[PDB]
């Protein structure tokens, strides 16, 4: 369980990632893509881009990004009471999309590296790790559905 003060901590800096959704979102794809290489292949929609200038220069990418971050944010303005809006994203990223859990940890370190290049002054330690407990909590809780639905490993 996150305490309120830790929640706090998460919405505070999240507020500050809703002044710029897009540019946020690009580069957390970015990242995760360029770490990652692996991950590009999951999406048949971006898997023709090679080069970061090439992820920048990318329209859809961006609104994939508002995509991923508009669905995180209403998950964690939950506070943890986020069964009906995790189940459909497990249901979907299990078996339509077949992403595994791995991939889900590869996608919070790229959250937590770029809240911390984008947001030092509300980023520092303590909201590090109350934001890494918050994504952890995501992760145990879709892995829970995997596991249900055949597909935890
Ligand atoms: C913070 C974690 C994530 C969130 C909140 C998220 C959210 C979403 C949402 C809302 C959609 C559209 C509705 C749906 O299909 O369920 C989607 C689609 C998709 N997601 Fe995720 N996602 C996350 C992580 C990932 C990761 C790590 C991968 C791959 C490595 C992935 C791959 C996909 C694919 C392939 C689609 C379909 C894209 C298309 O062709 O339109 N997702 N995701």
């Known amino acids: ?3 309120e003060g ?3 901590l998460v919405l505070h800096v999240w507020a500050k ?3 710029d959704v897009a540019g946020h979102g690009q580069d957390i794809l970015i990242r995760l893509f360029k770490s990652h290489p692996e991950t590009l292949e999951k999406f048949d929609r971006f898997k023709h881009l090679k080069t970061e200038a090439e992820m920048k220069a990318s329209e859809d990418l961006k609104k994939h990004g508002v995509t991923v971050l508009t669905a995180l944010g209403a ?3 939950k506070k943890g009471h986020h069964e009906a809006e995790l189940k459909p994203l497990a249901q979907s990223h299990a078996t339509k999309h077949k992403i595994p859990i791995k991939y889900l940890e590869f996608i919070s370190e790229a959250i937590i590296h770029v809240l911390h290049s984008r947001h030092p002054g509300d980023f520092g330690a303590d909201a590090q790790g ?3 407990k918050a994504l952890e909590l995501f992760r ?3 892995a829970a559905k995997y596991k249900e639905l055949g597909y935890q490993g």
Request: proline share 0%; net charge negative; hydrophobic share 55%.
């Open 1 to 3: 369980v996150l305490s």
């Open 6 to 8: 830790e929640w706090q």
């Open 17 to 19: 990632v809703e002044a």
């Open 75 to 77: 998950i964690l303005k």
């Open 130 to 132: 109350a934001m890494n």
């Open 140 to 142: 145990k809780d879709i």
